[PDB]
Amino acid sequence: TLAQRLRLGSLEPDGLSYKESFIVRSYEVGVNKTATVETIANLLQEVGCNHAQSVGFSTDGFATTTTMRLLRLIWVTARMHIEIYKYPAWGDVVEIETWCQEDGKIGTRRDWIIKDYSTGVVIGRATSKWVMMNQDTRRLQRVNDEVREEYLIFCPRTPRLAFPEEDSDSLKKIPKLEEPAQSSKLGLVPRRADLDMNQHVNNVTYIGWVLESIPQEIIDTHELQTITLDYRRECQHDDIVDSLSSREGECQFLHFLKLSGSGLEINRGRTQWRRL
Amino acid sequence: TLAQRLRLGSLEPDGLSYKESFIVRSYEVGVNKTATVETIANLLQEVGCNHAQSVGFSTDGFATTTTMRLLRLIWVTARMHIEIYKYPAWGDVVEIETWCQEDGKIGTRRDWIIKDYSTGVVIGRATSKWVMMNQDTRRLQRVNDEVREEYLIFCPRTPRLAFPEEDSDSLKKIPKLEEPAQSSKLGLVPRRADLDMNQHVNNVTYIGWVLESIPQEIIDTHELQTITLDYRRECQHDDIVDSLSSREGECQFLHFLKLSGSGLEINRGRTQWRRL
Ligand SMILES: Fc1cccc(F)c1-c1nc2ncsc2cc1Cl
Numbered sequence: 001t002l003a004q005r006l007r008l009g010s011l012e013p014d015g016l017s018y019k020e021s022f023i024v025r026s027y028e029v030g031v032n033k034t035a036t037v038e039t040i041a042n043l044l045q046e047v048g049c050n051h052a053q054s055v056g057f058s059t060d061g062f063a064t065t066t067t068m069r070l071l072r073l074i075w076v077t078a079r080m081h082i083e084i085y086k087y088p089a090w091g092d093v094v095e096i097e098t099w100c101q102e103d104g105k106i107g108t109r110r111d112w113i114i115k116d117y118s119t120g121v122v123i124g125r126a127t128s129k130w131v132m133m134n135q136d137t138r139r140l141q142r143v144n145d146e147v148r149e150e151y152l153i154f155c156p157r158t159p160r161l162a163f164p165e166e167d168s169d170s171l172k173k174i175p176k177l178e179e180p181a182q183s184s185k186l187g188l189v190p191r192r193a194d195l196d197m198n199q200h201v202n203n204v205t206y207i208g209w210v211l212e213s214i215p216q217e218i219i220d221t222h223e224l225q226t227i228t229l230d231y232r233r234e235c236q237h238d239d240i241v242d243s244l245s246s247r248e249g250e251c252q253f254l255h256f257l258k259l260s261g262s263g264l265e266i267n268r269g270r271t272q273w274r275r276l
Numbered sequence: 277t278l279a280q281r282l283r284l285g286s287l288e289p290d291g292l293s294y295k296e297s298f299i300v301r302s303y304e305v306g307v308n309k310t311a312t313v314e315t316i317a318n319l320l321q322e323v324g325c326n327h328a329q330s331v332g333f334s335t336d337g338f339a340t341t342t343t344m345r346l347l348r349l350i351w352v353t354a355r356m357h358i359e360i361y362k363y364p365a366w367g368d369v370v371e372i373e374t375w376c377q378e379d380g381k382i383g384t385r386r387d388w389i390i391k392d393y394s395t396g397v398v399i400g401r402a403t404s405k406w407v408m409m410n411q412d413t414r415r416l417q418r419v420n421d422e423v424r425e426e427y428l429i430f431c432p433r434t435p436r437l438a439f440p441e442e443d444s445d446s447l448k449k450i451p452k453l454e455e456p457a458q459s460s461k462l463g464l465v466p467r468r469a470d471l472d473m474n475q476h477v478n479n480v481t482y483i484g485w486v487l488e489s490i491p492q493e494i495i496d497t498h499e500l501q502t503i504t505l506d507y508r509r510e511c512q513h514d515d516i517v518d519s520l521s522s523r524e525g526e527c528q529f530l531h532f533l534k535l536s537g538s539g540l541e542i543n544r545g546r547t548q549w550r551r552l
């Protein structure tokens with residue numbers, strides 16, 4: 001397709017990773033005169049999509065194989081973990097590599113390295129854990145041996161980890177914060193613009209909501225260094241959400257999104273912050 | 277710079293208009309599987325900012341001349357008018373031409389043509405009125421003959437109009453909608469994410485707030501064909517917005533944005549809709 005030809009990317013030599021670069025646009029930058037986390041997350045999704053496209057997945061339910069489509073099987077995000085050392089500026093060229101390895105029998109892990117292409121310096125990295133689910137029962141699966149063959153051709157056989165260090169913050173359990181929470185943002189409702197292709201509430205919306213929970217004093221004086229998010233439930237368009245946070249100039253916060261009425265958990269998270 | 281070498285864009289020969297093309301990315305497409313209005317608005321900003329950059333304007337300012345810098349002056353939208361005939365799909369390429377001509381001495385008019393990249397068929401167009409504003413006082417300004425000298429070199433001598441037709445919808449005055457209004461979206465609040473470099477509410481957010489007021493039946497069964505938005509008074513980060521609309525297979529809405537507390541008008545608008 002024309003987009004594959006023109007895009008600033010391509011499969012890498014071994015064909016087991018994808019690389020694409022993006023010119024940071026003027027509207028992508030926030031109060032810190034640099035790319036918002038939302039922007040970064042979007043680009044993580046874009047390169048993930050384009051990787052899938054380039055190995056022959058026919059953009060249906062994302063990353064679904066020919067058999068998965070037939071057996072009504074999909075990939076759902078259990079965890080996202082983003083770490084940014086340095087937010088890029090308007091007009092910077094950011095290179096992002098992404099690839100996918102097996103994650104035992106439960107599902108799949110997608111990683112990302114984020115470079116400033118000019119310097120070649122790593123400005124961020126990211127890792128994510130996904131699980132196979134029957135889209136009809138919404139119930140988890142041992143990854144069929146049929147499916148594994150279809151996708152593992154396009155994955156490195158031996159570990160490639162964006163986070164290869166020992167007790168990696170990326171795999172740390174997140175506990176439920178104790179109510180009442182130090183900070184809260186109450187009665188949040190998805191806006192229309194927050195809804196994706198398939199009418200699900202966008203990952204960037206969950207990110208936004210986590211930040212809404214943070215005290216003005218911290219965002220005025222600090223920048224987000226890491227975010228971790230575990231997803232339990234999809235938030236419906238008319239659902240009403242309370243976003244909570246507590247602590248646990250370099251600070252961490254525990255997060256928790258629940259439904260205002262039910263009290264039911266939508267997600268929980270952790271965010272680390274650096275001083276400006 | 278590397279960004280300009282990699283952008284699908286360039287000044288035209290004459291140095292009086294700028295053209296840049298875009299691949300519609302995965303997260304830029306809404307429920308209709310086509311680019312959102314928020315993406316198209318964003319793209320119109322980007323191509324305008326890159327035209328500024330291309331004739332030697334610096335960063336930290338959209339088209340703010342050497343003097344404007346010194347006086348702490350910026351450009352703000354008085355009126356936006358967009359028309360889309362066809363929304364590009366995920367993966368499609370659109371070319372946008374943009375240029376800027378003078379609007380008496382109250383300010384400047386920026387216009388856009390949107391074409392399909394391959395064919396060069398017109399799928400959309402836009403025009404806008406901008407006025408100078410002190411970025412600190414947030415107060416509108418007499419356009420200096422000093423600043424006119426600095427920019428007028430890069431504006432075509434004789435009118436170029438994206439809307440060359442006679443009694444153009446783009447120039448028609450917008451009446452006050454009669455309250456109480458058919459449709460409403462109350463207690464809207466700027467998100468942290470809506471705030472730009474300088475800490476004020478993005479142009480695109482006001483468009484979103486207008487679409488929030490339209491009934492679900494319409495968005496489910498129709499596409500936005502045109503929008504006219506007047507910006508009368510700014511939304512502050514701490515302000516709360518009520519967004520109103522009424523009617524007046526092609527349907528129109530009169531719009532009105534006011535502050536929940538004051539009852540102060542910030543914006544008034546028209547939207548024209550086509551059936552999917
Ligand atoms: F898109 C892919 C191209 C090549 C190899 C892969 F493993 C994938 C893939 N990426 C995923 N990302 C999140 S779940 C998921 C599942 C798969 Cl099969």
Ligand SMILES: Fc1cccc(F)c1-c1nc2ncsc2cc1Cl
Nearest residue numbers: 327328339351376384386406427430
């Ligand atoms: F960017 C520009 C490049 C070239 C010529 C111009 F006149 C501009 C310009 N464009 C604007 N667009 C909205 S306000 C505004 C003001 C100016 Cl001075």
